[PDB]
């Protein structure tokens, strides 16, 4: 069982050891497009790049680059686009991707400012009467409504393709209580947040892949995607106890590097799955 394994690891404080084995086994693929000089300003971190084989391509003849990866979980029947928190100059690209990929939901796992510095650009409008226009990608974004709760905020946004005048409703799920350091004390709120995203249909097949991001779009974002898939798999399989989180994570790392940045995040993922399994079933 998973929970049984969990307790073993704590007993012997092997979290760092286990997490390191995952890192050593993790896939490695080229990221040539990401490294081209013309894309230097499109990357937030020099050590966080999308693999060429699974990168999202913007539908423009000029430069189709954006630091984002498509994570396709064949068995779970679920896909996610993991991306970095957009930059002052890639906000238009960010929404171009949301539009072209036909996404329904945007999942944000960080705050614009953390530990005193900017961890992501203010890419969405904060006031209904102050809409945003991205001239480079000819997109218009309008805050339609907002619902602030204790642990997260859900925003209703309208994205318009000014070229065609077509519009779409985009749901912004913003987890606002992730601690500055470490991980959450309890996976409880994180899990409710996840179910709230599910309940909205943003993760369902009738829509394009949900767009998930934090700062680098690999640590916290990894936690979200890993938890969701594992839980989903425990629902499909005849034998739910066969879901191996370390295996699932390795499968995900074939599509984007460094998903799950610390042993604390790994342990936290186990917690969320184990805890999420008890409510989802018991």
Curated annotation (Swiss-Prot):
A single GO CC term for this protein reads: early endosome
At the top level, the lineage of the source is Eukaryota
Q: Which residues carry this modification: Cysteine sulfenic acid (-SOH)?
A: 214
Q: Which residues carry this modification: Cysteine sulfinic acid (-SO2H)?
A: 214
Q: How does it sit in the membrane?
A: Peripheral membrane protein
Query: Which positions does the record annotate as the modified residue Phosphoserine?
Result: 49, 241-242
Phosphotyrosine occurs at 19, 65
Tissue and organ expression note: Expressed in keratinocytes (at protein level).
Q: Which residues carry this modification: Cysteine persulfide?
A: 214
Q: Where is this cross-link: N,N-(cysteine-1,S-diyl)serine (Cys-Ser)?
A: 214-215
Q: Which residues form a coiled coil?
A: none
**Enzyme Commission designation:** 3.1.3.48
Q: Name one GO molecular function term.
A: cadherin binding
Q: Is this entry keyworded Acetylation?
A: yes
Q: Which residues carry this modification: S-nitrosocysteine?
A: 214
Q: How is it modified after translation?
A: Oxidized on Cys-214; the Cys-SOH formed in response to redox signaling reacts with the alpha-amido of the following residue to form a sulfenamide cross-link, triggering a conformational change that inhibits substrate binding and activity. The active site can be restored by reduction.
Location of this chain's protein in the cell: Endoplasmic reticulum membrane
Example GO BP: positive regulation of JUN kinase activity
Tyrosine-protein phosphatase domain span:
2-276
Q: What class of enzyme is it?
A: hydrolase
Q: Fill in the subunit field for this protein.
A: Interacts with EPHA3 (phosphorylated); dephosphorylates EPHA3 and may regulate its trafficking and function. Interacts with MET. Interacts with NCK1.
Family to which the UniProt record says this protein belongs: Belongs to the protein-tyrosine phosphatase family. Non-receptor class 1 subfamily.
**Identification of the protein by name:** Tyrosine-protein phosphatase non-receptor type 1
Name the species this protein comes from: Homo sapiens
Whole protein: which stretch is covered?
Answer: 2 to 283 of 435
């Amino acid at each position: 069982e998973m929970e049984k394994e969990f307790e073993q690891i704590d007993k012997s404080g092997s979290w760092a050891a286990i997490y390191q084995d995952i890192r050593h086994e993790a896939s490695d693929f080229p990221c040539r497009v990401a490294k081209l000089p013309k894309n230097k300003n499109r990357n937030r971190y020099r050590d966080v790049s999308p693999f060429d084989h699974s990168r999202i391509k913007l539908h423009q003849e000029d430069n189709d680059y954006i630091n984002a990866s498509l994570i396709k979980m064949e068995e779970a029947q679920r896909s996610y686009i993991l991306t970095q928190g957009p930059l002052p100059n890639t906000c238009g690209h960010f929404w171009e991707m949301v539009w072209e990929q036909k996404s329904r939901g945007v999942v944000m796992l960080n705050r614009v400012m953390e530990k005193g510095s900017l961890k992501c650009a203010q890419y969405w409008p904060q006031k209904e009467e102050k809409e945003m226009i991205f001239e480079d990608t000819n997109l218009k974004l309008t805050l339609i409504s907002e619902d602030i709760k204790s642990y997260y905020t859900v925003r209703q946004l309208e994205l318009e393709n000014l070229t065609t005048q077509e519009t779409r409703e985009i749901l912004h799920f913003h987890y606002t209580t992730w601690p500055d350091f470490g991980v959450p004390e309890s996976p409880a709120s994180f899990l409710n947040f996840l179910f709230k995203v599910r309940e909205s249909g943003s993760l369902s097949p009738e829509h394009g892949p949900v767009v998930v991001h934090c700062s680098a779009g690999i640590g916290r974002s990894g936690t979200f995607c890993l938890a969701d898939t594992c839980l989903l798999l425990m629902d499909k399989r005849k034998d739910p106890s066969s879901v191996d989180i370390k295996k699932v994570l390795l499968e995900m790392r074939k599509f984007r590097m460094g998903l799950i940045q610390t042993a604390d995040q790994l342990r936290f993922s186990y917690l969320a799955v184990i805890e999420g399994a008890k409510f989802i079933m018991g």
